[PDB]
Symmetry: C2
Subunit: 299 residues, 2 copies
Amino acid sequence: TENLYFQSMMTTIAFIGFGEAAQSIAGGLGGRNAARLAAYDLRFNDPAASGALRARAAELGVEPLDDVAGIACADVVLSLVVGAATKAVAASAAPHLSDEAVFIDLNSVGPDTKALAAGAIATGKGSFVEGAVMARVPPYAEKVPILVAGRRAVEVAERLNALGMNLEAVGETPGQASSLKMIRSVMIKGVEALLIEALSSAERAGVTERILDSVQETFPGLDWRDVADYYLSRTFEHGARRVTEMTEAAETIESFGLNAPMSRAACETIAAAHAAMKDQGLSVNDGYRGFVPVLARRL
Amino acid sequence: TENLYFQSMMTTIAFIGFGEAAQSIAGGLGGRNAARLAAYDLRFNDPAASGALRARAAELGVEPLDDVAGIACADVVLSLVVGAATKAVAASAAPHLSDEAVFIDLNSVGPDTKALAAGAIATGKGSFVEGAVMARVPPYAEKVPILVAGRRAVEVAERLNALGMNLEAVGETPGQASSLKMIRSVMIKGVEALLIEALSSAERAGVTERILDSVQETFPGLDWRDVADYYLSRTFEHGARRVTEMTEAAETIESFGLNAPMSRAACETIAAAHAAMKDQGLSVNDGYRGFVPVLARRL
């Protein structure tokens, strides 16, 4: 019950980058022959990695391309490379895209870099759609939530959703998808940071339960102890990667001509708290009753 | 159905400071002759203010005291003076308190200053209880929520609650009541600040409604649009005074040996946003749909 125009259509996808994320995505698509798959990777040319990578390409039913120019055949090019390589990749692909083709940039970079990738693509004939991957890929494969933005975002979402992928078009302006992903971090990690600051303060003052009561009375819809349990355990376990996500978010907001003091302070806070909790005999299972006394003392 | 020990008891209260807050409190107590009331004020000695202040003392049924030494008669002394005068007041009263008397400091100062007030009182015979007034006094009079902390906090709460006041004992340690008041600000104004940062960012990126959706999905208990309506209108109207409350909260947290980056960033944010919104034709009634585009542009 997806779109007819898109089911009765010749659909070739080329990955740029054939790492884990690209592999799991191509994994879930491969058995269906939902589309002719291909992948360009530099390691396809490295004698030390070539054999092992080409076998896996064969095992997931993806064709290895020897060169970037092998993407000329694709309707949709997916760019999943190391963040640092984003622009370089874009610039390589640009001359080889057909004028109907869409390059979707799925890299973990801010709207600024996305804009430069879009610019490289524009020096050739292809279209650019900006994407942002909303979850880790392994647990979801090809149904990982992706946000897309651009002239052709609705069009590619529909086309790739007809193949079983999980895209939503969030705007016509490239930059909007990574902006949305980054800003969404601000509320979520901002709240986590506020709990860290309020609760460890409260704890040093001996009024923790009373302060949880007072937040519970002010914002009654949520169970704030469940919130503090959940998000402080997130600081415990993934504090390092949560600080990266925050650092990027501050840069995104700054990139819009806005000061980002909440995002910067939250990043600092989550990093300080993660450090504070390491090697203290805590468990992700321990709750705020567990974490807060440690943070109180260690901060 | 309050305590018998406290109803069948000789109960004299002396205010130090006879301003609005002290007047409204003494107002609601005065008609009942719930207690022998008195008040020391410097203006009781100023020919320019004396007549007018003594008439109002008579109208609310409070006795003027010519001197601080007139508090020797009180069981409970209430200190409501300008923040700056807190310690000075405490030091004046200390020699005059009886050894059964309780000095309750109700001034808008942090636990640090409260501790110094407590120290002055300790150089005499009286007891010290630390209080913190939780709302503006005019709309509540004598039933304004007060938090108290100290050895005798339970005792004074019960005694003053037997006279119709609205006290809760929150701890045995002086400093806890103002700590609790201040820290409670962190979550509340932190959230307001996070909405300002997230929403005006989102708005510059054209994804405001989507970001509200994504906060609504993450923290489903609350209606986040009502939250943003409510708290941004608070930034509009009372942004100036909300920044003071935040500045104090950062100092309180700092006073505990903790860095206060969330509190400091929130204070900055609320002040920046309040400034941004002034003289833009906005109304407290306007909601986030109204405020956010203004903040987006003006920040």
